Structure formats: structure tokens, C-alpha cells
Amino acid sequence: EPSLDNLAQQDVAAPGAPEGVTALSDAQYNEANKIYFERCAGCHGVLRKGATGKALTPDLTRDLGFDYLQSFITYASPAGMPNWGTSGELSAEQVDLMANYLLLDPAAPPEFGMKEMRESWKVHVAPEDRPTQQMNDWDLENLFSVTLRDAGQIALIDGSTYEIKTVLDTGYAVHISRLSASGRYLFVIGRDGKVNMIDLWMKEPTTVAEIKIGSEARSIETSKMEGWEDKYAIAGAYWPPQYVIMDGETLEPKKIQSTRGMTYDEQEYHPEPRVAAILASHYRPEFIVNVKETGKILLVDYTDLNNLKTTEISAERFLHDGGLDGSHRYFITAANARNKLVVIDTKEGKLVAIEDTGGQTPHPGRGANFVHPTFGPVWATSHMGDDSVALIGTDPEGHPDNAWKILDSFPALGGGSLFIKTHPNSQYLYVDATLNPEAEISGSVAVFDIKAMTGDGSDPEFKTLPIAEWAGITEGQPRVVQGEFNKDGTEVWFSVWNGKDQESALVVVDDKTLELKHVIKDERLVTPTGKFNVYNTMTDTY
Amino acid sequence: DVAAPGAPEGVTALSDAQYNEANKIYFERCAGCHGVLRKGATGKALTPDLTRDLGFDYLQSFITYASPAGMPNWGTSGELSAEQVDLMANYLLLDPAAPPEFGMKEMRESWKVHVAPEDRPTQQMNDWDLENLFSVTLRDAGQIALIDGSTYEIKTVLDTGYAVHISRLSASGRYLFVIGRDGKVNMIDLWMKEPTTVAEIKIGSEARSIETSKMEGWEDKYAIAGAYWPPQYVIMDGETLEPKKIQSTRGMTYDEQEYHPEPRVAAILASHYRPEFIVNVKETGKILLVDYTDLNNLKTTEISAERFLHDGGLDGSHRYFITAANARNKLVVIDTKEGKLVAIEDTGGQTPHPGRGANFVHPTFGPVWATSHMGDDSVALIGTDPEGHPDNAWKILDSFPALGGGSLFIKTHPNSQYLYVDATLNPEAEISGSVAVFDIKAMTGDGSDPEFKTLPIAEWAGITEGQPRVVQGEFNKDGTEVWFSVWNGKDQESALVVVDDKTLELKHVIKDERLVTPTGKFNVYNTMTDTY
Numbered sequence A: 001e002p003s004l005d006n007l008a009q010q011d012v013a014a015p016g017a018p019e020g021v022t023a024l025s026d027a028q029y030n031e032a033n034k035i036y037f038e039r040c041a042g043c044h045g046v047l048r049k050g051a052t053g054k055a056l057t058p059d060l061t062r063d064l065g066f067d068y069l070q071s072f073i074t075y076a077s078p079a080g081m082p083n084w085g086t087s088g089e090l091s092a093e094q095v096d097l098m099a100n101y102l103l104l105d106p107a108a109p110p111e112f113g114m115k116e117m118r119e120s121w122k123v124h125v126a127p128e129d130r131p132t133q134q135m136n137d138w139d140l141e142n143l144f145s146v147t148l149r150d151a152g153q154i155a156l157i158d159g160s161t162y163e164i165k166t167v168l169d170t171g172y173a174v175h176i177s178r179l180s181a182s183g184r185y186l187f188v189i190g191r192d193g194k195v196n197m198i199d200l201w202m203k204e205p206t207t208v209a210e211i212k213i214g215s216e217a218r219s220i221e222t223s224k225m226e227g228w229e230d231k232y233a234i235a236g237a238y239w240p241p242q243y244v245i246m247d248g249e250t251l252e253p254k255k256i257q258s259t260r261g262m263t264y265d266e267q268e269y270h271p272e273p274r275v276a277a278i279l280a281s282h283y284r285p286e287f288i289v290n291v292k293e294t295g296k297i298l299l300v301d302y303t304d305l306n307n308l309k310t311t312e313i314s315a316e317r318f319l320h321d322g323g324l325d326g327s328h329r330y331f332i333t334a335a336n337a338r339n340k341l342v343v344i345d346t347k348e349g350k351l352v353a354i355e356d357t358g359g360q361t362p363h364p365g366r367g368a369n370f371v372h373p374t375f376g377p378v379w380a381t382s383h384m385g386d387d388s389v390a391l392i393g394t395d396p397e398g399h400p401d402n403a404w405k406i407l408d409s410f411p412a413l414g415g416g417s418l419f420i421k422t423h424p425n426s427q428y429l430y431v432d433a434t435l436n437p438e439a440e441i442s443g444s445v446a447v448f449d450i451k452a453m454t455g456d457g458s459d460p461e462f463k464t465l466p467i468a469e470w471a472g473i474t475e476g477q478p479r480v481v482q483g484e485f486n487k488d489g490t491e492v493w494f495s496v497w498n499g500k501d502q503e504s505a506l507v508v509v510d511d512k513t514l515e516l517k518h519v520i521k522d523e524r525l526v527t528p529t530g531k532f533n534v535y536n537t538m539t540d541t542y
Numbered sequence B: 001d002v003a004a005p006g007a008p009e010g011v012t013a014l015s016d017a018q019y020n021e022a023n024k025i026y027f028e029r030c031a032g033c034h035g036v037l038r039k040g041a042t043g044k045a046l047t048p049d050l051t052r053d054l055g056f057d058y059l060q061s062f063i064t065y066a067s068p069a070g071m072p073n074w075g076t077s078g079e080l081s082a083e084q085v086d087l088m089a090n091y092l093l094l095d096p097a098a099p100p101e102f103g104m105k106e107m108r109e110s111w112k113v114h115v116a117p118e119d120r121p122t123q124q125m126n127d128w129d130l131e132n133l134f135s136v137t138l139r140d141a142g143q144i145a146l147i148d149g150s151t152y153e154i155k156t157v158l159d160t161g162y163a164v165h166i167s168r169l170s171a172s173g174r175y176l177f178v179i180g181r182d183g184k185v186n187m188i189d190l191w192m193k194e195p196t197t198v199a200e201i202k203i204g205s206e207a208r209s210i211e212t213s214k215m216e217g218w219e220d221k222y223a224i225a226g227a228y229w230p231p232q233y234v235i236m237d238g239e240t241l242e243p244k245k246i247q248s249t250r251g252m253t254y255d256e257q258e259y260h261p262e263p264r265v266a267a268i269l270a271s272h273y274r275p276e277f278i279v280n281v282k283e284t285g286k287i288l289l290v291d292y293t294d295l296n297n298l299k300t301t302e303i304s305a306e307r308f309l310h311d312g313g314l315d316g317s318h319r320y321f322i323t324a325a326n327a328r329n330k331l332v333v334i335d336t337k338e339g340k341l342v343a344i345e346d347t348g349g350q351t352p353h354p355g356r357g358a359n360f361v362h363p364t365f366g367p368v369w370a371t372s373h374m375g376d377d378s379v380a381l382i383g384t385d386p387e388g389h390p391d392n393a394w395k396i397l398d399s400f401p402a403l404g405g406g407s408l409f410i411k412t413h414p415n416s417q418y419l420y421v422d423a424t425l426n427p428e429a430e431i432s433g434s435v436a437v438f439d440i441k442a443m444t445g446d447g448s449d450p451e452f453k454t455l456p457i458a459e460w461a462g463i464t465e466g467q468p469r470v471v472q473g474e475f476n477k478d479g480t481e482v483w484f485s486v487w488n489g490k491d492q493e494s495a496l497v498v499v500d501d502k503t504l505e506l507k508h509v510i511k512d513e514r515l516v517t518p519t520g521k522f523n524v525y526n527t528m529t530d531t532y
């Protein structure tokens, strides 16, 4: 569940206390408010309307009373509520503050529309003043854009020499980097809703435009339909619940759409549907937008923004991440809280199937496409809740009997996995275990030989790569996360994510031998997490 | 009951009891003009940031005394006692109460199928001329009267939702749908020996519109209803009224692209070119073309138009939707075949209110669609023929006066040479009780104001008690006779007046003790075919 710390840093005036409630001073309220958005709003919602956790609105809390709230916040619950008090995570004083805060009127966060976006919109280098051709001698397609999380920066690293070409400041922790279809523009989205556009053709690449699109955001994508290269970029926010279509060269906000609506199943109004993953169709000039809480997938046609055509597909609640199959026609996405994979046909714009993975909390990232020796084309995902890896058939025409069925499920290193990865030129399938409590596991990666798979019910064995050990890092609990290949698919990189004041690293593995190749360590390499190779990102190769 | 909000510095707090008391008075009485979220609509915005600056006494006065601009005298009229006034004045200084939602669970609890489809007639069992029947709203009585179009006899009086706003017919002409302003929907089977409500459902708190599927091949398939609150539309099964799909209209205004928490659904029409419903969303200025061929993979086209969309109608060919963005004095034109905005024109008048409008062939201009105005006495014509009259297409070709301001409906029929215009809301009794009639064939469009004949409808009905207001002309199946309602108070005398279209003379006056506050009238044939 998300931490909405940028919303937390918002200062609000303390509301008055109604009948039977004690009032908090502006200082007490604000202290409690920051805690709420940083630690509770992810599960309970910004508006306290509920998401993973129950609703905590005044009408409900005032009936429960101070003592009930105080105890629950203190001791937690087995159902999922954390023991803030007994764990020592929150002081006795803060627990009381939270209990009081919950009895008061919810702080209504501000909206953020066109006026607000335009005020934050800054074009540093006008399109006219930009290069007409690449002015640096870098191999752009083999460049890696790495998130230096806590430092609010990104590093551009050379894919063949491993030289850190440049470290750029964005102002706040970014979540991901995405590339325009031409590979010229790099877009980074900050957790604070800040979008930075970087021109990779300049002698010294730098931000040529920036804009804010909300208070909390995690996703962005570029137009990838042939004929629409560099035309648009779209960003989605957690708060306010909306997505925004922007000009692909200036970041000028063109269209803002609210995601507030009815849940697909119960058809009950939901005031806070967060935008999760956003992908771009290769079959139609459309963006694919996941709306989490309502369980809807939107196919947004960008050929006409005034007479806007959209297809709202009823899927499954708690949609998060996902990716396209090998042919780029089908979108496969995880409804994580419900252990389901939803398959969408982007050519026809319809729901194809919804399958239970048999695992707990699938989290594929964009997933991994490969041709299984016996099953044919499949897409794979690992899970956060357990050690299982599941395969789903993705070839309706060639292997009709295997299409959209979970063909196999087998264990990898352990629970806490976040990313699975492969490349068309590789015969290996890499699976991490980032969130595993055991250091030996979270610092390692499991590797399966695809060519050795038989799908005869037996569990395929895997090799364990001690990534953290190879990096020479033992201080703190380094967590290895996300494999990402170079342009050729001959080398795969992993982040050895350590604390802000600890030593981190990036480990390059030779895909053909599964041996350590190179370790990147540098003082500026603070909390490296997501890494994105320009070529693989712009072409959706995974 | 809602949770009472805390009071800021200077603002007095209200007990949970007090607040809930003031909240109910507001939602029942004031919400309609000021908006359920106090954002304002047909009244000023009463949000905290504005009210607090005004102060207690300022609010307290406006509540008790009122004003000429539209605010009623709640205190002096005795509608609200002294205490209630002070309660409301303080309530307005507090944060707005979150109104109740009404989703699937709520609709299904109100859904009742009285006669299942399999238990209904397989053919017409009564001997009525269904196509010539008129469904008349008996406003304050919460009933509708079904009246014979040729004999003028009340065939039956049915109990429905309170103050039905409109009647709409399924494309086959079999099912009659009515929607009360309370969100209550009644479905009536006209094939039964004695037609009656076969299914009912409630779709919200406040509603005004309903329509049936009219694309060839989709007859009787679906019905759609729109609400003012909550801001949403619902697609229902056309035979059982089962709620199938609910869509919220909350979203960004088309122009400033700011979030609006209360965009009311106004007029809803059905496309004849694609299997879609045409939905006007007032406050955001958007027109939605909702494709009903697949409710799970829902395709919609959201057209940015102009704010304050209200009513409108299709042109003669049924391809173009012309609607009034009333508060901005504009007519928005949509091409339902291509699914896009074609034009936006100012009428030159104040507050266009066409109803579904009037289509006719102007002697010089060719095909046109007309609208009268609530704010002034003008009638404006817009060309509707891009193919045969390209130079006249989507341009206001002429504007001339009728009886006076306060007009609500303009009407004609393909077999008539006359254009009827009412003046329902005119303050002068002589005017509100009459109708202006223009001879289409005598129009030259040379800039001179066409002369009209005045029909003393109320006088013909023999009603002088109260100030009866004549409203909405509606033709019979053949377009040989036109009906008007002589709308008087609930305890006053009302009537329906039938005029012979060819001679412009009184044909018949319908009076009956059961005919209470008659307003909307809808001929079955003309409504199911969109003939206007």
C-alpha cells in the first residue's frame, strides 16, 4: 500500500470539534494529519472512505468512540491493521493524536485542474531552440535511466561501459522513467505529481519542460501507435483521482479526465479511484489506463480530444500493474488484492478473460514473455504474498487449448517477489524476492532455464545468484530489485537497494554465463531502485 | 442522518440533533435552487467561504425576507419559524453535508416487477387506437391520464410517481415509461386489457429524463433515465426495468477543465443512426453518446460542447442533435452519425428553451429548426440542411417576435402549415393564456416580422379563475389537431383544449374532475417516432 508523503507535507487548519468530541490545536492536528497521509491513507484512503482498510469517516468513528480507536491503533488486528502502538512505530502520544484526529472532520485535500497545472507548467527550452539531430555521441538506445529514490535524482548510465554519464535533479523521488516512441524524450514522473521531460539529443541532456499534474502520482506513458510517435504523453494520479493527456513536445496539458465513478461489480459510487499502471496500445491510437478501486480499464483514443472516444472495460477491483504479451496485442494485468489476472484484447477493445493465479498478490511489473518449450507462448508473473511463479498461455490462434489458462505454477526463492524478467535473446527467467524478510533471500535472485522446462507437473529447478554478496555489501539489509536487460539482451542489471546513508550498488550479470560481470558503485548512487534501458522501454520488449 | 461538522472560530456549533434538523430542511427545500452541494445553480452559491464573509445577520435576513431575484421569503411567509430560520442561518456557516448516494443496491431494493414478461399479453388485448392515445401528466395528483385522441375520452387514470415530468414510448409503441421528479420510474404495458404498471424502480432523489432505445434492431431493448441527484444515468432492461449499468456524470467542465461535483443530467434523446443514447450533462457542458451494444466494454464519446445544456431535439432527418445551452444563449449542434460537434451558434435571444423544437421547411431558407425563448419574445430559426442548403446550414437565418417573453414550447407537424408558440411564463394573464400561430407558407425571410394569429386558448376553455397558463402544443397522430394544456392550480379549474389545425378554430374542450394540473401531453405515435 502507498505512502502519500507529498500530501502529508500539506499544512491544514484544524477543524472545530462537534458534539462529544475534543478539539485539537492547529499544531496537534497538523502533526496527526502528516502521520495519516504518510502511514494510513494508503489503506484507508485520502478521504477516509476506505480501500484496503475500512472507512474511517466521522459518521462511523464517532459511533465507535475514542477508546475503541485508541486500542485498535495501538494493538492492530490480524485482518491487516498494523500494531502502531505496541510495535513502537507510533508513540503513545501519537496514538492518542490519531484517535482524536479520526473523530474530527476529514481534511479535504485540494483539487488540481487546468488552472493549477498551467501555473506549474514551465518550458525551459522551446521546441524551436532544441537540436535538430543528436548532438552528443552517446549510444542512446543502450542508455539506462536509474531512479535514485531518496535523492530525488536519476542517473543516466552507459549500457556498455557502465559510465555514469550524468546525474540529474528532479526535486523529488521519481517512480519511473518512460521513453517516447522515437527514443528522443525521456519522461520521469515524481511521486509528487511532478513531470520532467528530458531531451536526450542535447550535448548535455537536461529538462526542457516540467509540469505538475496532481499531489500524488506514480505513472506515465507515451504514445506508441505507429504514426503517433512523440505526439502525446499521459500521466495518472492517486490524488486527485484523474489522468492527464499532455503535448508530447511541450508538456502542455490538453485533457484532464476524472476517474471517480462506480465500482464495476457493486456499481456503488467510489470517490477516490487511483490511477495505477498506464500502457500504450500498438494496435490503436489509445492509452490503456488501469483504475484501481473501481476495477475498470480505460482505452482512451487520443486522435480527437474534443470528441473523446473511450472504452470503459469492467475488469476486477484492485488493478495495479501489467504488460502486453509477446505480440503486443493483449494486455495482461494483475488485480492484486484479488489474486486475479485480467486479459484485455487491445485490437478489439474487449475483456477476454479473468483467471486466478493460485498465488497470493500477483505483482508482475510488466511481466515476462517467452516461448515455453511445450506450452508455446506464455506470460509470467511472480507474487508478493508467496513464492509462486505462474504462467498464462498467450497464443489463442496457435495454441488455442492453452490460451488464457494458468498452465503451470512453481516456486522460486521465496515470498516478497516484485519483478520477473527475461528477454527474447535470453533463455533465462530472473525472479527477485525484494521484500523477503530473510536477508539471504532478499539479497538474491532465482534463475530458471526456459529451455529445460517441460511442464510435466514437476517443479523446474533454479540457480540462485547472490547479487548482494557479489556487490560486496553486507551493511544494513540490502534488497535486490528488478532485473532489466541491455539493448542486446546479453547482460541483465539488478539494483542492490540499501538505505539512504548506506552503500548501494548496481550489479551487471552476463546473461550467457550467469556470472558476475561488473559492479557499479559511486557516492552519488543513493538508493537505486527502478532502472530502464531506453531501447527495451520504448519498444516494450519484455 | 449525517455527522455534524465542527464549527470554526467565530462560527457557532450546532448539536448533532440541530444539524440533522437543518440538513433535512435544506435538502428538501433549498437543494433544488442552491445545489445539493451548495455550489449554487438556480440560486447563489452558499458555500462556507462565501457565507462566512456575509455573516450571521446577513444570512438570517435573506432567509426571512427574501428578494425579487428569486430567493423566497421563508420567514415572513411562515414557511420557517424563527428558530428554524436561525438554525438555517447557522447551518449555512457550517461545512456542507455530504448528500446520500443511490447506487445499484438501492435501485434493486426499489425494483419491483409486477407482471413478469412471460405473463404479459402476446398481442394487444384492448381495442384502443394506441397510436392516437395521449399520455397526460396530472402534475400535483401524482397520476397520468391516458386520453383517446379522437373521442377525447379519458380511457384511464393511473397512479405514478409525484409530478411526472415526461412520458416516453418504446420504439414499438407498446411500453409507456414515465418518470416522476422524485426519481420514480413506472413502466406501463399498453397491450393489456386494462393497461397498468408492470414494473417500477427508483433511480435517484431528483430526476427529469427518460428515453427508450430507438435504433432499428434495438426496439424494446433498453430504457435510460437521468438524475439531477445523484449525478448519474442508468441503463435499464427495456422489459423489466432491471438496472444494468450506472454511470456517474461527475467530472471536469469542458472549458476550464476544473472538477465539478454536481453535473446534472438534463435532456436524453436516442440516436436513429447508431445504437446510442444521447445524454446532456448540464454543468460540465458535455454531451455523451453512449453505445448500448455492449454494457461490459462500454464505448462512449464525450463531446465538449457548451455549459448549461438543457433541452433539445433532432432535426427532420433525425441525424443532427440541436440543443440549448440555455444560460449562455447558444445552440449546440451534434452530428449523431459521425459522433462529433458541428457548430455552436448564439440565437440573439435570452434563454433559448425549445423543448424538442420544431422542424419545418421554410419557403425561402429550406429545412430549419426553431426555438422560442424564456427570456424574451423572439423565435429563432437555424438551417438544418448541409446537403441541399449549404450556405444556410447551422446559421441563425431569422429572428422575430411572438406573443411575449416566458415562452416554453414551439410546435409544428409535417402535415401542418402552422407554427404554434406559447408564452406560459408571461406575467400578463392575457398573454400566458394565449398562443401565437405563424403561417409557415407566408414566411418570406425578407427581414420583416411575420405576422401571427393569437388564439385565446384559456378564454376558449371558459376559465378566468386564477391565472391559467397555457403550455405545450402536441399534435395527434395525423397532425390534424393540436392539444394545449390550460394549467391552473390544484384546487382551481384546469382543462385541455383541442384546436383544429386546418381552420385554427376550437374543436373541443376537455374538462373532468380528475383532470388536475394538466401539464405535459405526449401523443404515442409522435413520441415513439420523434415526429416534431
Ligand code: DHE
Pocket (backbone or CB within 6 Å): A001, A002, A003, A004, A147, A149, A174, A175, A176, A218, A219, A220, A221, A275, A276, A277, A278, A279, A320, A321, A365, A366, A418, A481, A482, A529, A530, A531
Ligand atoms: C502504479 C505503479 C506502477 C506502475 C507504473 C506505470 O505503469 O507506469 C509502479 C511501477 C514500478 C516500477 C516499474 C517497473 C517496470 O519495469 O515497469 C518500479 C521499478 C517500481 C518501484 C517501486 N515501487 Fe512502484 N509503487 C506503487 C505504484 C506503482 N508502481 C505504489 O503505490 C507502491 C506499492 C507504494 C508507494 O508508496 O509508492 C509502490 C512502491 C514501490 C517501491 O517501493 C519500489 C520497489 C521502489 C521505489 O522506487 O519506490 N514501481
Ligand code: DHE
Pocket (backbone or CB within 6 Å): B137, B139, B163, B164, B165, B166, B208, B209, B210, B211, B265, B266, B267, B268, B269, B310, B311, B355, B356, B408, B471, B472, B519, B520, B521
Ligand atoms: C431536463 C428537463 C427536460 C428534458 C427531459 C427529457 O429530455 O427527457 C424537461 C422537459 C419538459 C417537458 C417536455 C416536453 C417535450 O415536449 O419534450 C415538459 C412538458 C416539461 C414540463 C415542465 N418543466 Fe421541465 N423542467 C426542468 C427540467 C427538464 N424539463 C427543470 O429543471 C425545471 C426548469 C425546474 C423544475 O423544477 O423541474 C423544469 C420545469 C418544468 C415546469 O415547470 C413544467 C412546465 C411543468 C411540470 O410538469 O413540472 N419539462
Ligand code: HEM
Pocket (backbone or CB within 6 Å): A001, A035, A036, A039, A040, A041, A042, A043, A044, A052, A053, A054, A055, A056, A069, A072, A073, A077, A078, A079, A080, A081, A082, A084, A098, A102
Ligand atoms: C495509520 C497510523 C492508521 C490508522 C490511524 C488506522 C486506523 C484504523 C482504525 C481506527 C481501524 C478500525 C476501523 C473499524 O471500523 O474497526 C483500522 C482498521 C483497519 N486498518 Fe488501519 N489504520 C492505520 C494504518 C493502516 C494501514 C497502513 C493499513 C494497510 C496495510 C491498514 C489496514 C487496516 C485494515 C485492513 C483494517 C480492517 C479491520 C481489521 O480487522 O483489521 N491500516 N485502522
Ligand code: HEM
Pocket (backbone or CB within 6 Å): B025, B026, B029, B030, B031, B032, B033, B034, B042, B043, B044, B045, B050, B058, B059, B060, B062, B063, B067, B068, B069, B070, B071, B072, B074, B088
Ligand atoms: C432553503 C430553506 C433556503 C435557504 C436557507 C436559502 C438561503 C439563501 C441565502 C442566505 C441567500 C443569499 C445568497 C447570497 O450570496 O447573497 C439566498 C439567495 C438566493 N436564493 Fe435561496 N435559500 C433557500 C431556498 C431557495 C429556493 C427554494 C430557491 C429557488 C426558488 C432559492 C433561490 C435563491 C436565489 C435566486 C438567490 C440569489 C440572490 C437573489 O437576490 O435572489 N433559494 N438564498
